[PDB]
Design goal:
Strand content of chain A: 25-35%
Number of domains of chain A: 1
CATH topology of chain A: OB fold (Dihydrolipoamide Acetyltransferase, E2P)
Protein name (chain A): Telomeric single stranded DNA binding POT1/Cdc13 domain-containing protein
PDB class: protein binding
Helix content of chain A: 10-25%
Distance between the termini of chain A: 36 Å
Largest interface: A-B, 25 and 24 residues
Structural class of chain A: alpha+beta
CATH class of chain A: Mainly Beta
Radius of gyration of chain A: 15 Å
Organism (chain A): Candida glabrata (strain ATCC 2001 / BCRC 20586 / JCM 3761 / NBRC 0622 / NRRL Y-65 / CBS 138)
Largest sheet of chain A: 6 strands, mixed
CATH architecture of chain A: Beta Barrel
Keywords: OB fold, dimer, dimeric complex, protein binding
Assembly: dimeric
Shape of chain A: globular
Oligomer: homodimer
Number of helices of chain A: 3
Chain lengths: 133, 127
């Protein structure tokens, strides 16, 4: 429910830099990032926190280094799941490993939220298989 | 946790890589509140409300956490946890004093913050 067909695809990935972008850009950013937290709100929303690197020993990750990626609305959630039931368990294999996501700024409600494109649980599972082989 | 400082840049706070021993005094707008199971209150604040054509980027938002039964109960006093207690606070300025709590993600939390005190701040404001 947003036209992103015009958008140019870029490989910029500094998450700290992405979190500072004040204006809606017409770009899709390809990220290879670690999923470190997933939160589910009923069957209405999935929030995925990602970072470029897992923190080193005795280190912490500040909020600016975390991109919060939202899959929002019944339709987007169902597209993400396909023929799969929404439970926390489906996210377990993805935690603290890298996945490739393609994200864009979705405007709401004046807060910018980052959202993924053509992201599905089946596709993330496939990425894991490639990684593990 | 010990030095009290005046801070006017949530963006800067969001970048602090390490735990500090500082309490940061903020005069900010509450723009969103989320409640999780009588277990946690998450408060989103910004230094300035967005002007008519504009947007707020994530780095300009500080997410403040009141976490656990103890902290939540302290925040409430003799009050019932519902979203409507936050209605008069939304899109208005409140003074908060915040610090960084330890998982591997740094989280900001407020100090000696209660719904009663926030309500009193509003009464003063509305003078």
């Amino acid at each position: 429910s947003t036209d992103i067909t015009q958008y140019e695809v870029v490989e910029d990935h500094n998450i700290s830099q992405l979190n500072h972008l004040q204006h809606l850009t017409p770009k899709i950013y390809v990220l290879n990032v670690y999923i470190i937290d997933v939160e589910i709100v009923y069957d209405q929303e999935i929030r995925i926190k990602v970072v470029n690197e897992l923190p080193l020993v005795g280190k912490y990750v500040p909020p600016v280094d975390i991109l919060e990626v939202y899959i929002t609305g019944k339709e987007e959630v169902q597209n993400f799941l396909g023929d799969e039931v929404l439970t926390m368990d489906i996210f377990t294999p993805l935690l603290n490993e890298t996945s490739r996501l393609r994200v864009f700024q979705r405007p709401s409600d004046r807060i910018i939220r980052w959202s993924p494109i053509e992201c599905t649980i089946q596709e993330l599972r496939l990425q894991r298989m490639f990684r593990l082989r």
